[PDB]
């Protein structure tokens, strides 16, 4: 309950879950998230 990656901050399916890119949200500040 304290992140920028709505992906995890929401409870959706993440592929980079439990990471730092989730905090910084760098995986949610370019175009989209997830995409193995
Ligand atoms: Cd995430
Ligand atoms: Cd994701
Ligand atoms: Cd991430
Ligand atoms: Cd993300």
From Swiss-Prot:
Protein name (record): Metallothionein-A
Conditions for induction: By heavy metals.
Superkingdom, natural source: Eukaryota
GO molecular function, a single term: metal ion binding
The protein's role, per its UniProt record: Metallothioneins have a high content of cysteine residues that bind various heavy metals.
Keywords of this entry: Metal-binding, Metal-thiolate cluster
Family: Belongs to the metallothionein superfamily. Type 4 family.
Boundaries of the shown chain within the full protein: 2 to 37 of 64
